[PDB]
Assembly symmetry: C6
Homo-oligomer: 82 residues x 6
């Protein structure tokens, strides 16, 4: 049960990422995190395969809207989230 | 391709309220809400038909431009079963 | 029943605007909004005439304290506020 | 011209607490509170007589300057019926 | 010199979650939590033995560097009676 | 019963200051304050002597981690805090 995240500059690029990820595979949206400097992180949860597929599609879709600052998959054993 | 989310991201809140007003008066769109992400950035979100949403965002963006900076303008067509599920809310 | 707003860089310029607007005409102070980057929006509600008079006086008074970033009147039919 | 609001806006919180202390010890002014607006900006607000408020803000600004940056210093004379009504509180 | 606090401060949240994961898998350290201070800065805090904490922070910092910027890496040895008392929590 | 504070750029430098202050003298940690721009203020309370000793040690320790923006002691008569 992996965690996946797309970090963007702008919220529009983050919602675009969230839409692309959930349509792409069997992943559940955990939520959003605002850390300032116009930075928003979109977090998904699901099996490793579904998470890797979702983040690649979420990053590719956000890229067309705004600047993607980070794309990452953590195949974890939600304790690690804020 | 029937249901959609629309957004106008501005630098300044006045430009965002101006966008929200122009959107709802220009097309058959319902205001979902606002989001503050820091750096003076505010996102205005609307919901309605893809055609209505594309028309609202173009009018929202044009009206906000007269007040402040518009940083982003975007339309996301949605499945219609859980249109608002992808929003932070 | 119009909405009026003065957006400033600095809070002192915003409180100065709020004071000038409420003394100028029959307008009710809705509140303040902080959006970061030192930006503060002062919002008033009242009839269109009273709102246009208040915002012109609020902008002119704030100008003497700090930098006014936006001045606007919306003659609306509070649903549109955050 | 009898009741007034006073403010000292600083870059840094230490300079703001230093201003608040200098204000209350220098003149017959009551501390209303603080406001954080981002960009490291903090506003200290005082209430009292116009004369006392002008004297407190000058001492608050001078004391804060030794600690940090002072971005704004201002006095607003108020009607006395609803002195604090204009504040965000 | 037995109990310690460790921290990795990053620009970006993804780099912070990556640090948190690398820390807990690399050494016998417990994740305390996160702190957002603005400017896109996030601090990840761990608790454990001084040796384990120095090993976790080095692995957390190295793993975060592959994702984003690491702004600070630090180890604070603690008395063991009230290890977490100094944290903002 | 004085107030003492160390203002830093970064949270790590602030926690380092808090640790150095509490070990240095008989001072109680009031708390932390985040004002944005990566600025964090660490506040202590105790007798004037203990507070002056704590802030000097807290500033010296933070200096080795990050940039200290302010160091100050107020020998007060907690009303003055946010």
């Amino acid at each position: 049960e992996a965690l996946g995240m797309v970090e963007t500059k702008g919220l529009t690029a983050a919602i675009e990422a969230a839409d692309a990820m959930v349509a792409s595979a069997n992943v559940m949206l955990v939520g959003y995190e605002k850390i300032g400097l116009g930075l928003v992180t979109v977090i998904v949860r699901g099996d490793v395969g579904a998470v890797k597929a979702a983040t690649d599609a979420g990053a590719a879709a956000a890229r067309n809207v705004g600047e993607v600052k980070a794309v990452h998959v953590i195949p974890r054993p939600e304790k690690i989230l804020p």
